[PDB]
Amino acid sequence: MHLICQSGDVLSARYEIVDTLGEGAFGKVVECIDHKAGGRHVAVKIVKNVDRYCEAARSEIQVLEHLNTTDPNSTFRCVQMLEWFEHHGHICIVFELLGLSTYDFIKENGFLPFRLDHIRKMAYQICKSVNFLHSNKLTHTDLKPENILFVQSDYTEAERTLINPDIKVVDFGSATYDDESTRHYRAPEVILALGWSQPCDVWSIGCILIEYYLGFTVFPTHDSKEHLAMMERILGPLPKHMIQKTRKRKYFHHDRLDWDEHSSAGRYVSRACKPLKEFMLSQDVEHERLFDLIQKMLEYDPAKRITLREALKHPFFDLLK
Numbered sequence: 008m009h010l011i012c013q014s015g016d017v018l019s020a021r022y023e024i025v026d027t028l029g030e031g032a033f034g035k036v037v038e039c040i041d042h043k044a045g046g047r048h049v050a051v052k053i054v055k056n057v058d059r060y061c062e063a064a065r066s067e068i069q070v071l072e073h074l075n076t077t078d079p080n081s082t083f084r085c086v087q088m089l090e091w092f093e094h095h096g097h098i099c100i101v102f103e104l105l106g107l108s109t110y111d112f113i114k115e116n117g118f119l120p121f122r123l124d125h126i127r128k129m130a131y132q133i134c135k136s137v138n139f140l141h142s143n144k145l146t147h148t149d150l151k152p153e154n155i156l157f158v159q160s161d162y163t164e165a166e167r168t169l170i171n172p173d174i175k176v177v178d179f180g181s182a183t184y185d186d187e188s189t190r191h192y193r194a195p196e197v198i199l200a201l202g203w204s205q206p207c208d209v210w211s212i213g214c215i216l217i218e219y220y221l222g223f224t225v226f227p228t229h230d231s232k233e234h235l236a237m238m239e240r241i242l243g244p245l246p247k248h249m250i251q252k253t254r255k256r257k258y259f260h261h262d263r264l265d266w267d268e269h270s271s272a273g274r275y276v277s278r279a280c281k282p283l284k285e286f287m288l289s290q291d292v293e294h295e296r297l298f299d300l301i302q303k304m305l306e307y308d309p310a311k312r313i314t315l316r317e318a319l320k321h322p323f324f325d326l327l328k
């Protein structure tokens with residue numbers, strides 16, 4: 008990786024790297040000047056030369072080629088791929104240049120939360136976009152703030168003040184069609200290995216929204232049974248039917264979760280977490296509307312869980328309507 012993507016390098020005899028925008032498990036993303044197109048800047052995704060990540064990159068190009076053709080204007084806010092190429096055995100995908108991810112923006116503002124009016128618009132766009140994926144037999148499976156990106160003209164910089172937050176959605180290398188990729192936004196049916204599909208995206212959007220509103224993550228765990236105990240503290244006890252169905256019966260004793268809440272980590276889930284409604288900062292009706300939508304997105308059972316077509320109909324978005 009390091010050898011083939013430093014500042015000053017030229018890719019495919021026209022893309023001159025000028026900055027590194029970020030680094031991932033897939034590799035790197037660089038900002039480049041496109042010398043054969045007036046000097047317009049672009050973003051270039053540099054994928055590791057590993058079989059896992061090259062098969063994902065090839066799949067990602069197939070998805071982006073389809074989404075970009077189905078939606079030429081990007082009405083549904085999937086990032087647009089301009090071309091791809093190979094560079095010293097690395098797949099490089101060229102994109103339109105966007106701005107900060109929503110995660111970088113909060114992070115570099117001291118983890119301030121977003122304004123509620125921004126959250127309302129950002130949530131509408133994330134829902135409208137991921138619904139468009141779902142209507143094309145797709146599941147993103149890797150929805151998170153790092154993968155939601157502003158379009159640079161949406162904010163100032165000096166201290167970043169967000170102005171008008173048109174967002175785009177990126178990274179389709181984990182995307183899956185219905186024929187036949189997580190961190191702490193992982194849905195319960197995924198943790199429990201009950202199978203999953205598009206509803207797990209809805210759950211991850213719900214985890215994104217609460218983070219927008221708090222500035223910090225509400226499941227700050229790196230352990231899967233602690234994540235489950237957190238869910239119970241914030242959202243209530245998991246459904247008996249899901250507990251009784253998982254092959255992962257390592258986490259439970261009878262119908263209850265196997266967890267000594269007076270252990271040092273059991274005391275951590277009490278300090279770190281509390282029922283969802285109490286996380287609210289106002290009692291204003293627009294705050295009540297947001298958390299109602301979030302409560303529907305954080306529904307345990309993936310069948311009960313609100314779809315995104317219904318989420319677009321939620322009163323929280325009437326102020327835009």
Ligand SMILES: O=C1NC(N[C@]23C[C@H]4C[C@H](C[C@H](C4)C2)C3)=N/C1=C\c1ccc2ncsc2c1
Binds near residue numbers: 105
């Ligand atoms: O497919 C992608 N996956 C990612 N992932 C990352 C993960 C971290 C946060 C953010 C920036 C880096 C690090 C790459 C998105 N970016 C992608 C694409 C992309 C397209 C256009 C664009 N314009 C400015 S940044 C940018 C990134």
